[model samples]
Target chain A: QTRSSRMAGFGHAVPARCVDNAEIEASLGLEAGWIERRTGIRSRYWAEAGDTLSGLAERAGRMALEDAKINADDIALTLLATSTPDHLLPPSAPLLAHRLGLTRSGAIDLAGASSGFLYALTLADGFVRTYGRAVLVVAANILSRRINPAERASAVLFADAAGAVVLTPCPEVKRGVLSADLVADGSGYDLIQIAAGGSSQPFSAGMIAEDALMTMRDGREVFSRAVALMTNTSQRVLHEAELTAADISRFVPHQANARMSDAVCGNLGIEREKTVRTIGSFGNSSAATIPLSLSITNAERPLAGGETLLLTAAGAGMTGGAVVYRV
Target chain B: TRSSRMAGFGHAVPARCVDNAEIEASLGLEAGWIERRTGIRSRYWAEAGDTLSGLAERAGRMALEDAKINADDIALTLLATSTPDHLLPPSAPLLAHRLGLTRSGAIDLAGASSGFLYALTLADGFVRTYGRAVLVVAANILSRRINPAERASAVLFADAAGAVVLTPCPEVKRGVLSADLVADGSGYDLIQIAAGGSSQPFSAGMIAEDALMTMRDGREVFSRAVALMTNTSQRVLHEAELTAADISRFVPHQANARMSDAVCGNLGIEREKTVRTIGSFGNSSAATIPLSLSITNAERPLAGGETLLLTAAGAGMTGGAVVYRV
Candidate 1:
């Protein structure tokens, strides 16, 4: 049985204090208009020092619960999608679960970088379809701290924020995940990653000296891949859902680079006005992009009882995916 | 929908090896008596500063492919045991999905320290009820590199592995029948796990110091826990299908010295007469016990035909269980 309407979602975002173009230009000795022209970014949020990923996640998660108008205890699962976990051992889901007071619900963490939210959405949809229950999926990242400040390409673009959505079960109302698609090419695993902290090159004095915490990526190559993947995946999802661009009321792309999203949407023939933009204020919040956009759309009252929303993203693992829902 | 037999399986192990005697003597420890008592001579393998989740997964994966007669296209997945996969990502299912497989049914189950065999039994039952094919499960831990001087335990343990593939449909002749299980709350939290790793108290220094991996009550917990896990699990198999006399093999729990042999013997289950592995492998926890059973039980000199046997063990926080098959 295929669900037509599900995931009574409520989204939340906690952006750090905003840094406008003037602030960015002053800090990094770069032109404010350069960022705006190149990336469609006008301002971004950077968490204060000591503002950890888990802390941002908790705030966003609680806000999501509040928006859903349900106590945290009503949720049955906490699926935390984050590249930066609070710890290495237990996964941040359990701790988040503990904090949320959903003591009985299962908690687990997953990592898929920017596409984490889409992947997690697909997974949570599977669980709901299989078990007939609701799940709280949080896509959170504190990228500001991990970014290499010296590397203008990497640091100037990334920011810290968390966006979450609670996915509910049932095929009633605006509640169906119309379609989803995920594809990965492992040949590029090394292009965008933090190398020294893992088993491959454990954090020794030598590894630490190499600055393993920040990500390193071939930006041009990644941008090209993201364009292809996001375009293809969005097309596949629309085809599967038996819908075309004419039927979709909104399109939410991962807040990566403005150029990549613009290129993909141009290929899809989707109107730029139909798509929401967060890059100007949030940079690439990775997995948090879709939820953040959803929040924006919902706030503007653009999503009605049965409008269709399509989401697309690409990220590390050289992976990309898409999901569509009737909202 | 619980499964009655193993369909297809796989596992991986680190390549860098450590002999138990060498580890023992390095700490000014006892010698021959170690092997004479525990039956473990060589064990403990480490990744040579270059391997991560992908490499280790390759080893376990090859074993599963060979044993289960299946490729990497499993649908429903369950990572039954644990291993440290990188710093922040959950590696078990990710590794599976990364090997050109989609993770439609994938999750990690943490039954701290129980062998993969226990997880295998549970998953077998799940597939039976759910009707999914190809369950890939594995357990590997790189503990030695972290706690280098714990000679008492270092000498008795090894780094090795085993894995099986399970399906709903099986050959008419053989499959799993039933399993027995138990756990005691007495030792809950006695093991002294630092919160930062998985249970909170998150910090950077705690991760570097390996505080999350440290255990305080290893000694007393190992002794009594092993004996009880083995005895009860073996007895549970008797109630499910074969009695002690009807058993063609014994895959005792791999936890500590004299524990496997002693428990099997006490059940009127012969030691040398059955599959013997602990004496040379120490306790590879989830990997050793299951891998030993799979390797020895499938050997030519063994029954060769249909056979009845069981797998059982106790692990951290005193969880224990056994699965029976004929």
Candidate 2:
């Protein structure tokens, strides 16, 4: 018998501080209306300075497990997806695992930036389909901690938040995860990279002087690729699941920008209302955007039985991923 | 019908420079005779100033592809040993997949230094017992990168090396003919490890300062545990199939001087017929010993239909593994 993958539970955690578009625009010298009109991002939350990537992750993990009615110890494995970690060594997984009281369960962390949540979700789906256990997938970013407040462009758009999903095995037909895909093109490696922390530059005082803390990007190039890749991958995943945009009850795309999402859906001919968007309030929480939107949407209007939900995301490494599921 | 886990394939790569006696003598340390009495003349290659994680992983990925396999596409994932890419990110499966493969199947195994070979054998057993097709695994160490000079305890170890095993279906129960394991947690966390690496020191600079390197109660930990694990694991493998004399070749543990040879003799096993690589290579922690055996065993007299045998190893987290087949 083939086992099905289900989103048994989910949770999202955003930092305490909230910044409205007017506040962001005034600080960065960008016009508030343009910020709102261009990105559909009116405001977003940025974690307090003392808050850390691990803290946010653990918070979301606890919420997810609590929502699932399971304790942290019940989870056999934990997969954490983030571009930001508490430290460069001894990944956040073990520390978070230790904090969550999962002494025996195994844990690991990976990075794929904005698309990391979906990428992690894809991994959880595979584990459930193959291993048959509940896997906790989390995507949390404390970008504010790393953001160079002086870099107007990044400072205005980046924010801090976290989200998680609990995947469990199911025995049903056409009612759980249908298909997922992950794709990457290294040609755009430098387009949105942290630049110096990894082996290539290997973190020197000079690189830090160059502001390695600030994320550098060719905004125009990224926006173009984000649209194309997210759109293409989304279509492929839906097709793989034997469905079409018309059949999808909701579309949750990564919140890099409203224009990017709008452009892709426009190209795909998907209706505007069908898309679940949180950009106006969250900006881009990297991997946390899509699932956060899903959590909020489900709380407001839980997915009806048999409704097909589609999720797609793209980010630096020029990576992209998509998945489809039926509730 | 249960599936065979790791059916076929094995490969190893060591550094070219530095012979054992030369290094030992240059350091005004022990003699080649001291090393040979234990059974190793030279360990194989390692690049200067490389971390255990980088070296082990580089060798592992290369060997996996050499075995004509793709991991990111697999269903089961176990890293089968500790020692990681970064103390933080679980880089095995992710990096493996990032290198153009796709493996959601990966987790670290912490069975002591013997983990690589033991993991390979474990993977094979799992596949055969539970029905799996491909169990990809490797063993490597960048001991030289992290080894401290003042403390000869770690300085003697050399570069990272690795071995890959791909299990394919066998017609006559040829794959994984027999296996064995031995452990002594009695002196468990004692041998000496720089708490600074993954568990304690916890930072890049701390790691560079040799904080996470080895600090052994060598006399007690090395001598006793090495002999025990090697002897016990070998016996387990032997009882499953052929006797010690029936074995065509041997690849014993890669611990301190004479550890491998000593265990062989204690078991009434012959030393002249055994293979060794500890002299030049030093001790590579998890990657050292098994890599030495795989290097000598593959594509030589130890080729097809030959009975190749060896015990897997490590210190502090001491344990042993035995695998035999052509």
Candidate 3:
């Protein structure tokens, strides 16, 4: 018997403290509209410096569970895709599972920067299809803690947020992930990185103090390549699914920046109204953006169950992916 | 000697091997006490040049060669570990690139001790969906992180990498039969690196305080691990509709001699049927189980149609078991 998987529910959460561009610009001693003009973010939420991750992730997970109308115990596994885990030792997925009251969930963490959710969703799709069990995938990131406030590149662009989706095992063909295109190009891995905090350059206080913060090699290159990568992958996925841009009712792209989103949509011939834009409120939450956009967009105008959605992202590790789905 | 062809497994260890006396003497324990308590006679520790990714690359290469397949054939690369070479860009993508797996979609699975099983489980599903091979690598260099002063963890963890290429086995339905993975966050603090993460961002003061990874409560960890592994293994065996007597080879995490031995005994498996490599290599977190698998199979190839049982329990209080039909 062949098994398949479909998205059952979606939920998102953001920290309470929403900082506007003026506030961040003032903190950095830059022009008032410096960030908004460049990053396409009017405001973004930043979690407290010493806060734990489970709270936000748990809320999103619980909402997804409730939205799915399923019991927590029924979830067979939880995949938390995040680069900012509370600890470096044990993954945050288990704790999120415990907080969500998932009694017997197989929990694990996945790291892929901005494309974390895309990777987790792709893997979860296969997992549910093969194992015939429910999978809870949550992409949560507290990027504020890893940002260098003094550096304009990271400070203005990154923020904290979480988004979750429940995938249930079911039959194929009607409404599920029709096709996906996942890619990891290490050639550009160094473009976006935290110089220290890992084995290659384990933190050495004085040596990697500021280096521990997120830094980009070239913002222009990242923007250019990200747009190209996301666009190219989206096209490939569309072709793989045998569906053109005409079939996509909602083009939910990674909230990388407004221009990049616009570029991809323009390249794919997706209409302006068809695009989902939730970046203004919370900047680029890295891994958490796409589903965050999905949840917000779905709430404002509910999906009528037959809507075809195209999801996409590009991020650090130079990882990027595109997925074609039906609600 | 090379046991057989197409086993699709490989492992790599640092060149420097440290014996029990060296650690026992450094940690101010009786020479025989180290051996008696941990059952680790010797283990590999990374030298200056032995990096985490370097070892994984080598291990993955060996596995690729063992399978006699080109890297381009791999559709995905999943590297399982708590320790990655870099904090920002995961090593999986770098690994996939370095190994010339141009077509593979790379990502890291951060499941601490039971990560490889998660990656393996993921690969099993991926192979089924994509109809292409998946490269699963589990490696860690804990020697750099384990403080020598902490005898509980200093003697237990080691450095090594193990890898296997999982592909579709359409010939005889010889692949993953059943898998059971579980985690309990209540005991997440049992083992952890106190700093170097968001909860406690790395700082000079933190370096002076508590920096290295530690098993806070050794006795509690041991007891919990034993219970977790035993129960998880039995449950997975039951899921596969088999019993201890049906498992052709029992490959468990090389966590510690006592825990592995207890889990084996509790599961009613014969000593001869269980694979034991902890005496020489100790714990390598997620890599231990795969290392044992590759090592055991290299010496004596696992026969086709034979059932193999793999189980693990460690950090995050995570436990997993897989019943594979070879």
Candidate 4:
């Protein structure tokens, strides 16, 4: 029988320090309620000094392992999806694996920006099917350091958070990742980026002071692309899985912004109550948004057996993808 | 039975090239010292305008064309690189987008120099599972990461990219045969940048020297890498029910020509059968092996049913081996 991958467990971790909209507004010298009106973000967590991406990822990973009722050694691989890694050369996954007590597991870092969790899930499914072992997929981002404090657009949006899921083989063929679709558009590569600190523009004093920070260009373009891709991909995945809006019990769109998430659900014809929203509190934690939102939504509504969950996300590289899960 | 076939291969490097003599003179070292010790005579370095994504795109496009497949045919892109175009958003998606693979899934896999082998292994699994074509591109702009003052590392690293198209095949025994991937975290800090990560966030006061790539205990690295590569290659060969004598070609990582030589010698493989590219490529990190394959294939393409053994060792203390039948 062909092995299938099931989402065994989900968990998330966020910085303790919450930066409210008023705090951000005060910092950006903008009027109160500006962030809420523009981005629908009331508050977000910022990693204080000593908070690291790997630390947050470890916490979420530990929780997921606990929820899955598996020992750390049971994990054969740890796939960390993040753009803000702890180290550039060593790729934080191995260190994360070592810390998680997955001493013998193969660890790797997968970068897909905000849509990373979906991509990692797709890969993990393939791996689980091939290797017949549990794989831990962690999506964590500490965008607080990358975001330009002076830029209201990014400062009000990006946050620090980590989310994780343990994928295990399931005997029931129908009960796991049903279908997944991924897409990327390089045309908008510059739409959201940190221009310096990379090969294109190696770090320098001048660049570090300015271009090293994250910048978002043409928000209108980003908004339209994010919604269109998320909606279109979600529809395609649902179609592939032989499902529709009516079958979906929960529509967990990427917690980028409430407006974008709402727009995607609106286009998909999913009712407002059916959609899960965490952007109000989490802001945009890049790759962590989807899983973090999933954990929060599950805690609140609880996913009873046999419910179809539609997940989708869009972000940097203009990368976007969707997944259909039957819980 | 399922198999992932290597459909096509291509490689690309920056326009600017530098030889050992020039580097030796610049670093105030003897010309023969580099060639004798590292076995590298020349390598390509990316200029300010040359980016990792551009090199990867060129190589990926070539591989797709070589495979006689359109961009639309690729369902996924796996870019293996430690040095990327940006630290926030991965360079793979952008390269995929630039390659016009609008519908493909894109992700960056970082395993340092051994990254290509890891990526190839993953691509094989993905191809077998998804039954779709995957573009595996390994590119690195190590020139930008190296400290100009660090002669040992600066002289050893280069910038380049190599890509392969992997497609699903019905013949279970005709393509990827067996593989092994291993990592030793004890050596993680041995080869890495000390700064520019969550471990050491970049700061204005931080010395520029700290952000640059550094390598410690080259002797220990060399010995361990050779042992791992050789042992892993033998393990894969044994799993595939083959021997060193049965291997038609030994395409080891191009991190160091001497390391490749040591691995080939230890495996009892004929020196003539080994495909070497470190002399010209100067260890383009994960891009080396595929680039070497493309070069070897360009000179003399593999015939059907020829057995090839691939191996690599690099940062993260990562190492892996694969057996392929052409």
Sliding window of 10 residues with minimal summed lDDT for model 4 chain A: A203-212
lDDT of 1 by residue, A165-191 (tens): 877666553357777776565555665
Instruction: State the weakest 10-residue window (summed lDDT) of model 3 chain A.
Output: A200-209
Docking class of 2: incorrect
The residue-by-residue lDDT of candidate 2 on A1-327, one tens digit each, is: 436777777788888898888887777777649677777788999876567776788887787777788765557556677766664433455556656665434455556667777756765664565445667788887776556667665676788888887777777767787877666654565566553333223333223433345455678888988898899889988888999899999999998888888898998789989999888888788888887887778777876878888899887756677888888
Q: Which candidate do you rate higher for TM-score, 1 or 4?
A: 4
lDDT of 3 by residue, A137-243 (tens): 99999888888878888888888999999999887665678888788788888898888777776666466567778898899999888988799889998998889
Worst 10 residues of 3 chain B by lDDT: B1-10
lDDT of 4 by residue, A34-85 (tens): 8998788999999988888888999999988888898877787788899888
The segments of candidate 2 whose C-alpha lies over 4 angstroms from its true place after superposition are: A22-27, A149-151, A205-207, B1-326
Candidate whose DockQ is highest = 3
Worst window of 10 by summed lDDT in candidate 2 chain A: A198-207
Task: Flag regions of model 4 displaced more than 4 Å.
Answer: A301-304
lDDT of 3: 0.86
Better of 1 and 3 by lDDT: 3
- What are the RMSDs of all candidates, in order? 6.8, 7.7, 2.6, 2.0
Predicted model with the maximum TM-score: 3
lDDT by residue (B1-326, candidate 2, tens digit) is 32233332333444466565665664576665535444446655544444333454565555566556655434333343344433222334443344444423343444445656545554554444224333344444434234435444434555444545444454554545655443333443454443322123222333343333454565666567656665655565656566777667776656665566567776667876776667656566556554665566454534556666656555433354455564
Question: TM-score, each model?
Answer: 0.72, 0.67, 0.97, 0.95
